[PDB]
Amino acid sequence: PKDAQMMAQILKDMGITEYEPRVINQMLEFAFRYVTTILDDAKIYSSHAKKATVDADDVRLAIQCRADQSFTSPPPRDFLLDIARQRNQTPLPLIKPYSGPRLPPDRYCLTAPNYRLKSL
Amino acid sequence: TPLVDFLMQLEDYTPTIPDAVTGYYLNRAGFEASDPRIIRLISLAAQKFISDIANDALQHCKMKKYTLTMEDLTPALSEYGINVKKPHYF
Amino acid sequence: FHAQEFIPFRFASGGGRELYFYEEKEVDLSDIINTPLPRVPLDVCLKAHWLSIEGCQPAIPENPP
Amino acid sequence: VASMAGVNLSEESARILATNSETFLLQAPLQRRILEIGKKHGITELHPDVVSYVSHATQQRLQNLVEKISETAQQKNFSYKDDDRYEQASDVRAQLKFFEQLDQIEKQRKDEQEREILMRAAKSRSRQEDPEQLRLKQKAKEMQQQELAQMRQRDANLTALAAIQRITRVNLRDLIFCLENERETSHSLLLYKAFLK
Amino acid sequence: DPTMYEEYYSGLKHFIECSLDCHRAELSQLFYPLFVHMYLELVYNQHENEAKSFFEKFHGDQECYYQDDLRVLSSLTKKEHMKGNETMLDFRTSKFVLRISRDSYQLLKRHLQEKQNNQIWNIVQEHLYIDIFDGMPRSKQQIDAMVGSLAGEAKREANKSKVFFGLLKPNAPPQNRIPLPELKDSDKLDKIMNMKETTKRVRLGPDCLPSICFYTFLNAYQGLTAVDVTDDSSLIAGGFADSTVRVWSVTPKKLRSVKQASDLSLIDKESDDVLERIMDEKTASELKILYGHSGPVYGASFSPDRNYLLSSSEDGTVRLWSLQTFTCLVGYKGHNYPVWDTQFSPYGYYFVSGGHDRVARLWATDHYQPLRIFAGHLADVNCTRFHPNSNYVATGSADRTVRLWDVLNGNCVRIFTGHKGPIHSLTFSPNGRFLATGATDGRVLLWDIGHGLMVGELKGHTDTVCSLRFSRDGEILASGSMDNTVRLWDAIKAFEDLTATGHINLPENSQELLLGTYMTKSTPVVHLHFTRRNLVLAAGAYSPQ
Amino acid sequence: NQVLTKKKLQDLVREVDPNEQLDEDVEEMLLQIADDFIESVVTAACQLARHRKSSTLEVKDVQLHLERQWNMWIPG
């Protein structure tokens, strides 16, 4: 196909030699889902600005307002290094010698009487 | 306790989806088969969801019965807030 | 599909859509019922063998050559 | 409202009956708050019906989150053991308590062995030299203090005669549980920091 | 400025390739960081056409080991594409370290302090550190051995901190440095039968090559993603892609759960049998399946007392499974992202888990929150390994660096760079002096820990080296990779020699350090384990492929 | 500077449950969530207003960001 032969070149440019045949079919299904939610929001933004033609600033708005919600990322390095030094300053606690099975408080564990219904 | 009574009746009930298949997709998400009746209620809830979508789609087909087309699933899931996608790339 | 509310399915994979390029795009609804279901394969088991006996690889069927 | 059979309509209508079965932001500091973010875009003045619309929008954001954390803060206040339609299946906490009791018994046996060694070292007359003497001295100081405490308790007795609505509480777990489920604030720096608070 | 970046970079490219060959191989190090820092500054200032032209003109003169980073960069053409990458966002703000000699830096600074090239000199002194050592300029096959990372080849001032790399009972830490747990009488009973196994332990060396017992997973149509074996070869755990952990007993002794609380209340304690009395015989299998992860289990770690299985998965939780009740106890939710590895401490109280969120957390099995956050990596923390004294945590990662972290203060005390792919295996020497790391380039790099210097390079493997272990004596390092081979390396002849130049001349001796290579039948060697009698165990799902 | 006065938030809980008490940590996180919501909504609404070539930030702009990204549908 046309758009499915370009999908095998996006993977081969990323060095993906081996892949399942259903991999191309659902990256096209995601790419179709992504462009019919940019352009669906683009004509919502065009009707907000009251213009009959969806021009390039509408797609510039609908991309950056969908990328502000959908595609997130891990936390940044200046945020990870601040919560590290706030946590790594606290000294390590000592251990009670014969406390038993060392566990968190019981509202943080998964150890409850764990009931079930009576069969009748 | 209407639902507690129903789950107690769910022993001796065989659902449309098997418990070897409903229990497979529950084990995939961490839900382990402690009680068969609970697996059966989950199976029946999934069945009701698919059946309700299908019946709405049939009312749309009768308005425009017989064949279920993507243009029947499209207005049927639109009241659910679900925008279904055409394939369009095959 | 895409659910705006996102509450019926929250980041739950439905395993994709089994669709093809050379598909028929229309099937009969009793053809899918009357076909036999595929066999569920064997569960995972742990077998042990020998790659090396004091430096030498044995010619057992669990070894390549 | 756009969807007549919408699926979040049936959620918060059945959630309220589950909690029944057990903001109005300040207009003066908010109007300065909208205008300062408007300097970064060129939105120099705002419509007079917006600062009360954002306050109605902030209310329905938190009321959709206060109702959501209330139906999981009452999920923990359902005691099964009062009902007898339910049966207990696996009490692992009790087994952990039994393991702790076994560890305590091992500690007590070690203490008894130490006491036997102390009884052996009592007879120190240059026989085992430093080791017998060291064990005896440490034990004697502890024994004398214990004996004095028992004797002072007897002294205390004679002097003594002469002398004479379940409130449901929402934890941070219930708020965190209602953040990783919704699509917004699932991968966010406010939930990621909340794992350390 | 931006339209003449292909004139600044090509001028410095013309100066370096016209230099003499002793300084040319060392001055070729600043081709890659000056190519990326000029390309990323073009796309951050919204100069896309010029960025695309620069990428096309200079991408092919970059070293072959940099192809993956080059492909991620070729995708990055917009500014907002790079504003949510968080690896090139941290590359743009950090400084490339670029260890060069003073004999070659004099030729570089005599070509940059002049006004003819004051623009590329302005990019160098803004985006590049330069760490100068007084010595010989390194060869090209020695520079190739120690570069490969992003913000790579770190300073010698990082690798000069005092590291207590010795074992517990002048390089050993005190026992009260890290508050380690007590040694119980059941834990002291374990070491009594452990030294009975040490009596039958064979000296391996280059002559008495060990026997390898491969424990293959035969069907495994759910993909096996994690294996661990206990310290005595008694249990084998399997983490699978169908969100399950499966414990197998390999000794002829079935897996039993302890009795329920009603059955324990009627028996008495203080009995000699006690543990035997508690076992339930109604529950006795050769296989126990553990459910509760909502995602593929990627880490698996036993505790040294043979209770307390650990597992981490894609759903962002680390789970502590009991092996006496065979249920889940705790779910440690600190990552929102796939936790790629976890490991218990060799004393069994603390554990470290590294995830997709580019940190590694230190937990203690007593707190719902971590104790130490090791947050200096620029990509995913793929591996997390404890030191044999458990005062130091080594975290390999996907930004091609290995970092040692002190458990006190959470400080990075060593940075080991020189891998070309993401590190997928770490192991420590039983001495505590050395550290073997493997990555996707098929290279096993042996690092010193006191000197912070790589001491050897083992380059026999072809695909990703996913499992390393030293022997119980330290005589042999075993390597298992995706080429379905278990290679054995001489881990005594590799450490025969024990600076201020911050590097040693690596020997190119891999051929003499290979004692043997054994090929698996279509089976990637996921785990490597050494029995206490020095017998190699290996586990891998058989994939016909 | 604080827009939510920590007492009207307690009336948002009393309307749902007359017998419920939040923790101080929960209240502070709820206040942070409110502050973050106000900021994100206003920034995107202002992006829509610049798009409509306006300096006025009318509700149409605030109402559109709720319906498309948050699905709130507050009556205007």
Swiss-Prot record, chain A:
Belongs to the TAF9 family. GO terms for molecular function: ATPase binding; C2H2 zinc finger domain binding; DNA binding; DNA-binding transcription factor binding; p53 binding; protein heterodimerization activity; RNA polymerase II general transcription initiation factor activity; transcription cis-regulatory region binding. Induction: 6 to 8-fold by apoptotic signals. GO terms for biological process: box C/D snoRNP assembly; chromatin remodeling; DNA damage response; mRNA transcription by RNA polymerase II; negative regulation of apoptotic process; negative regulation of intrinsic apoptotic signaling pathway in response to DNA damage by p53 class mediator; negative regulation of proteasomal ubiquitin-dependent protein catabolic process; positive regulation of DNA-templated transcription. Residues 108-120 bind DNA. This is Transcription initiation factor TFIID subunit 9. The TFIID basal transcription factor complex plays a major role in the initiation of RNA polymerase II (Pol II)-dependent transcription. TFIID recognizes and binds promoters with or without a TATA box via its subunit TBP, a TATA-box-binding protein, and promotes assembly of the pre-initiation complex (PIC). The TFIID complex consists of TBP and TBP-associated factors (TAFs), including TAF1, TAF2, TAF3, TAF4, TAF5, TAF6, TAF7, TAF8, TAF9, TAF10, TAF11, TAF12 and TAF13. The keyword Transcription applies. The keyword Transmembrane does not apply.
Curated annotation (Swiss-Prot), chain B:
It is found in: Nucleus. It comes from the Eukaryota. Allysine formation by LOXL2 results in release of TAF10 from promoters, leading to inhibition of TFIID-dependent transcription. Component of the TFIID basal transcription factor complex, composed of TATA-box-binding protein TBP, and a number of TBP-associated factors (TAFs), including TAF1, TAF2, TAF3, TAF4, TAF5, TAF6, TAF7, TAF8, TAF9, TAF10, TAF11, TAF12 and TAF13. Component of the TATA-binding protein-free TAF complex (TFTC), the PCAF histone acetylase complex and the STAGA transcription coactivator-HAT complex. The PCAF complex consists at least of TADA2L/ADA2, TADA3L/ADA3, SUPT3H, TAF5L TAF6L, TAF9, TAF10, TAF12 and TRRAP. The [KR]-[STA]-K motif is specifically recognized by the SETD7 methyltransferase. The TFIID basal transcription factor complex plays a major role in the initiation of RNA polymerase II (Pol II)-dependent transcription. TFIID recognizes and binds promoters with or without a TATA box via its subunit TBP, a TATA-box-binding protein, and promotes assembly of the pre-initiation complex (PIC). The TFIID complex consists of TBP and TBP-associated factors (TAFs), including TAF1, TAF2, TAF3, TAF4, TAF5, TAF6, TAF7, TAF8, TAF9, TAF10, TAF11, TAF12 and TAF13. The chain holds residues 114 to 217 of 218 of the full protein.
From Swiss-Prot, chain C:
It is found in: Nucleus. The modification Phosphothreonine is found at residue 35. The TFIID basal transcription factor complex plays a major role in the initiation of RNA polymerase II (Pol II)-dependent transcription. TFIID recognizes and binds promoters with or without a TATA box via its subunit TBP, a TATA-box-binding protein, and promotes assembly of the pre-initiation complex (PIC). The TFIID complex consists of TBP and TBP-associated factors (TAFs), including TAF1, TAF2, TAF3, TAF4, TAF5, TAF6, TAF7, TAF8, TAF9, TAF10, TAF11, TAF12 and TAF13. The TFIID complex structure can be divided into 3 modules TFIID-A, TFIID-B, and TFIID-C. Component of the TFIID basal transcription factor complex, composed of TATA-box-binding protein TBP, and a number of TBP-associated factors (TAFs), including TAF1, TAF2, TAF3, TAF4, TAF5, TAF6, TAF7, TAF8, TAF9, TAF10, TAF11, TAF12 and TAF13. Interacts directly with TBP, TAF1/TAFII250, TAF9/TAFII31 and TAF12/TAFII20. The TAF6/TAFII70-TAF9/TAFII31 heterodimer forms an octamer complex with the TAF4B/TFII105-TAF12/TFIID20 heterodimer. Belongs to the TAF6 family. This is Transcription initiation factor TFIID subunit 6.
Swiss-Prot record, chain D:
Signal peptide: none annotated. It is found in: Nucleus. Residues 23-65 are annotated as: Minimal region required to interact with TAF12. It comes from the Eukaryota. Component of the TFIID basal transcription factor complex, composed of TATA-box-binding protein TBP, and a number of TBP-associated factors (TAFs), including TAF1, TAF2, TAF3, TAF4, TAF5, TAF6, TAF7, TAF8, TAF9, TAF10, TAF11, TAF12 and TAF13. Component of the TFTC-HAT complex, at least composed of TAF5L, TAF6L, TADA3L, SUPT3H, TAF2, TAF4, TAF5, GCN5L2/GCN5, TAF10, TAF12 and TRRAP. (Microbial infection) Interacts with SV40 Large T antigen. Belongs to the TAF4 family. It is linked to Intellectual developmental disorder, autosomal dominant 73: An autosomal dominant disorder characterized by intellectual disability ranging from mild to severe, developmental delay, speech delay, behavioral abnormalities, and non-specific dysmorphic facial features. The TFIID basal transcription factor complex plays a major role in the initiation of RNA polymerase II (Pol II)-dependent transcription. TFIID recognizes and binds promoters with or without a TATA box via its subunit TBP, a TATA-box-binding protein, and promotes assembly of the pre-initiation complex (PIC). The TFIID complex consists of TBP and TBP-associated factors (TAFs), including TAF1, TAF2, TAF3, TAF4, TAF5, TAF6, TAF7, TAF8, TAF9, TAF10, TAF11, TAF12 and TAF13.
